[model samples]
Target: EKLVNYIALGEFSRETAEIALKKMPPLDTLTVHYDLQLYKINYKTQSPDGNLTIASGLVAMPIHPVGQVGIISYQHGTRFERNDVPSRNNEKNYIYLAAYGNSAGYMTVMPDYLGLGDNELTLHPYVQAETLASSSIDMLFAAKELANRLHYPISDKLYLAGYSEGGFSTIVMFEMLAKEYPDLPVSAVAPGSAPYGWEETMHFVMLEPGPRATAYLAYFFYSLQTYKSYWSGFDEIFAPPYNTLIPELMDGYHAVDEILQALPQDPLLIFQPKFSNGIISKTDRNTEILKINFNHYDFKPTAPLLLVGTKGDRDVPYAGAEMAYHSFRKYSDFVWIKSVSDALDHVQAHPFVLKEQVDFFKQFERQEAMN
Candidate 1:
């Protein structure tokens, strides 16, 4: 059975690619070497409900290459709107990464994930590790098959990179590949500013809830309720108005800013007192279950692993990366953590993180060429 169906969107000439690259800050200085071809691939993947579904993703392939190029599966960050995905070309930052990565001599693919893009699910699985990894891995397989069918064969060297939520997805995918698809040759994995320690992060948020963006937490809890059945009802976790408001905002139509405006700034106020206290006090059974469910620390990556973050990351705390680094280093010497900047916030540090990731992945590509 065919797992992938794709159509070429268009081609980016070297000049056009350079124009697109200029829109992204650090990438503006990057030189384009090859024209790029874009494609949207709708592939078979399993949903959180364990049902077969078609998920869409984007593929950027170098029009000309020196040899068999490596494949980089670039997972995207948190997106509230269902259409703001790579396949739709709605995310320019992600598209720039795809363009620059492909122009730099690799086939870069970005998964739209399960609920986003053309998937049938109304609510995304959000930080659900298992489905995220499964959907991404399935996208890689689909992209590989698409590349071969298009006569641009890819090498066995698979590289994974993503930021924020995508960063969590990247690490989860790496763990999944290491455990289930051991034969797959993963060159390297780079996860930037990922919320790896979900339980700890949630606790911290609840304890220090101030004026900040709570849409992500709303999305997380909403996804949990929808997919994992973590809560019996929103009323159990959220306060009165929020229990009603959150569900309305998370209908896959509202933007993050809109959702933020609709909700309370002090995130703790939005949650039920019992629920918030349980999480902060570390006595919540559901929180413990979440910790166990999202735990990726037990296994060691067989490939070089780079965990990147900024000390000033306000969106997702830097502690998550540090925690993963400390845990993974106990199992393997290849794991390393890089603090890109101390002053840059999550948004400001993104370009620098990508630079580090691209440079790190290139080393392996060079080594492969020499061999």
Candidate 2:
């Protein structure tokens, strides 16, 4: 098998995990250290047009004695570089989150999304929620299959969680899996500071400052220009100078702060009238694409869920979480919103939120077993 021949087990210490998860609860009771298994999962997914394509993801597992363990598919927040993905393991920030789950006796799988890892030659769809789900769902299946071949068959227990864009992906994945793969059992999900209504946040970013709001805006515009057919070109969407400069800023070389410095403070000024009106006023113009891109809020998860956010989150407003909780609660009370912290914004709140979710998942797992 490709895994046996190509991949080898790598590991990090419990001490490293303790540092990342010390702020979290319940992790102190569990032993630290993780055995990592890298996987290149070949799977079928769709392009933005609903066209079928072969895609891949970087799947990881805790290196330990193979057993029936629940798989925690942790979606990552905004990432600019190709190597920063889970497969390359270049970014330790996201890696430590995996370490948190794995150290607590869960198998953590991070999808590289459609365009990033193996499909690095193509454009990343950015925060388009549907592809985020389809690609991730397929990657889950592929990782399960690959794990079986690699002598580690995962149990039916499945948990979904992510932060920021990853949090949005988690919600998308949960909805898709519930509707499409009802036979598969999902233990629970915890989506933290998800920009569930991303368009709403985009509008807020026009006036908001600090923590790379404009930088995120630039990346969103560039990604939309690359994939969304609704706009003919950057000139049609973004105003004069930004129409030319945003692409350069999103070249994967610049940090979010660097991108923010080079770009306008108010990103909405970059948008043309129609684009601006559609996003800001929510008018008839750009209606269809807006529905496809931004209107992915309603979902009734059959699995129990913990939708959490920080009131102080800058990149993703807490209102998105509140909106999602209400929408999801319409169908089932299993969905609950936890205001973990109002002090930490998008990045600062991640570690605490993840730790809280770990404890929540543990309770949900026990509850599921009882039933």
Candidate 3:
């Protein structure tokens, strides 16, 4: 427990928190904003292979929850630049989370993963779900102690939710916990627009036409190659100058647009023939490495699960959620998938997806109280 160190980042007044929440469209109009104390946490977790390292996160606890606090471990979306993370985020969309969750009377915590936060020098393990699970688990453990010390002890209830990368992380965390850490049973999980099938998502992204979102492709290769120590070298996977240019782009300092602007407009042209063919064939070593990262929603969940997605999403492709729903349906009766909108794209789906997610958790909490 001592491995987790907490530092007071700042405070959000009830007024400030409510004001931020009000910016999120119609949902903000219904929220009850509570003043919160946001803290920066430095904790210890391991890599997929068990290499010890320090990870950082943010914890926003309500000044008063009216009753016992339940914890919501929110994994974030794809972060292209270092500043995009919860600990360092200045974006109102991200900042409002502290008030949004806490105002609803839940103790909310968001992990900055391995490379973001104060550890920006490290290579971010982009779509590597297992590492995200481990990092999040470590933060939850640390948070239990920290929350108790702050006099806002968490109850037995634990909820999980995230968007995009966070959505992927949410499922991965639940899977990891279901088997490895049964002591921390989740009450429910709401993962929106997660790339459940990473390879499929990658293939779609790579083959998509002009004016593509190149930031995702860059993060995908950079994190995998760096974390796995892919020996083929960048030249074998990517064309000449891209290998040199991409490594520079992966430094965690560049903005998504900055990196995307530098990438080839037609990403399919960027890959080596062997690498491209191998991915399609699923025969490449790197392809198998990616396969291992997939979190199939096949197991029976111990709690309720509500998967939210938008049919219009192109970044992660809503098909991944559909695939998961099919997988979980075969074995679990508690699973349900909610299509929030048919016309909204990935970014636009976030607020609506999140509002529904919070509402699900709130209803579940109320149901528990009535029991």
Candidate 4:
């Protein structure tokens, strides 16, 4: 049994959920039809290096009388703190999504990725594709076992949704499920503000020198070097002082803002001239590895996919979403792209994107019921 332990996290009644939603403007308009039961699950999963490890996640189920519900696997965005994850219930944005999804009559499962939530791994994989999908897939299986033990019946419908880092994970999860678990019924997928085209995103970040969130870039390269062994040392890629500063900043202790304040304004300045120039000239081994490791646009999803983003996103470039939209269209016509707002940056567009995702997934539920 992959499921090691399950702990109850209390339930939310329809009235209580509605009251809570009222306080959250992004989800205020959503209707609450069913009460929700939440749980914390600890299960066995694989690390980035394929080593056995224990991971934690959250599962939210609607208390419908019929005991039949669809599944929505909601992936969360980047978090610097180890305990700021779904299982810990410290992230309100993540918790609200789970509550809203459950109230809408879908079982919501949110994984804390590999290293963030009670996982013993020394470093979080950040945007690494394989372990993100594998850990999430294992969490789904663990959730299934928990549901069965509680006598809750799940329907054939499954929906995948996430934003930012979660958005990247959502698309990867869709491809993995289609390729490996062909029989799993995935009705739709929504990836909001995700860096699907990582190579393109790096180009934008590296080429454009301005005041932006450099912490994300540092975290990305630091995670790749530490976990994937992409580089022998930080000095191979990062410039002097940064080579030493980044390792300490990304020790799972410092906050994102703290790391950002410690780094230079121009993200390019933090990287070695050789490394920065190689990425621009397309001559770097790390750049080649990044393209190979995170190329998610090459495959077709088994179900309809909605790519959502804001034109003004600074953290993850909106161009990547557009590129993914065009690439996926080459393989299938079921893919669609939507911009929730033209002026909203990555952080400001979260609520709008979540609403769009909820609306997209609900359409499939209506169709399933009609049949």
**Pairs clashing within candidate 1:** none
Q: Which stretches of candidate 2 lie over 4 Å from their true place?
A: 1-6, 19-34, 40-42, 51-54, 65-67, 91-99
Question: How do the predictions measure up, each by TM-score?
Answer: 0.94, 0.88, 0.93, 0.93
Error of 4 at 50 (Å): 1.4
- Please give, for residues 1-371, the per-residue lDDT of candidate 4 as tens digits: 78999899987577766766676567788877877788999999888877899999988888864545888898989887787788876536443544445456788888998878788886789889998888888899899999999998888788899888888888888888899999887899999889867567777776653345577778888898888776767888898899888888877788777877899878887888887677667677767677777789889778988999888787777888888899999989888999988888787788788888888888877785522
Worst 10-residue lDDT window, candidate 3? 91-100
C-alpha lDDT values of all predictions: 0.80, 0.71, 0.76, 0.81
Give, for candidate 1, the lowest lDDT window spanning 10 residues: 204-213
lDDT of 2 by residue, 1-371 (tens): 12222244355445556664555443445556565555556567678778877665566667774445778888878876655677666536434444444465677777777667665436677888788998888777777778777687566778898888888888888888989998998988888788767556756665565456766766776787687656677787788898888777666665656666777766666778777666666664666676677656686678888988788877777777787789888989788999767777777776678777787787876654631
Native-vs-model 4 lDDT?
Answer: 0.81
Per-residue lDDT of model 1, residues 1-371, tens digit only: 33557888887567766766666667676667877778988999888888899999888888768777788899999988888898887546444544445456788888999889888888889888999999999999888888767788777777899988899899889989988999988998988788767566775555544234477788888888878777777789888888888888988788777877888777887888888777767677786788876677668788989999898877776787788899999889988999988888888888888878888888767775532
Ranking by TM-score: 1, 4, 3, 2
Query: Which segments of model 1 are wrong by more than 4 Å?
Result: 91-95, 98-102, 209-212, 368-371
- Each model's backbone clash number: 0, 2, 0, 0
Off by over 4 Å in 3: 93-99, 209-212
Q: Output the TM-score of candidate 1.
A: 0.94
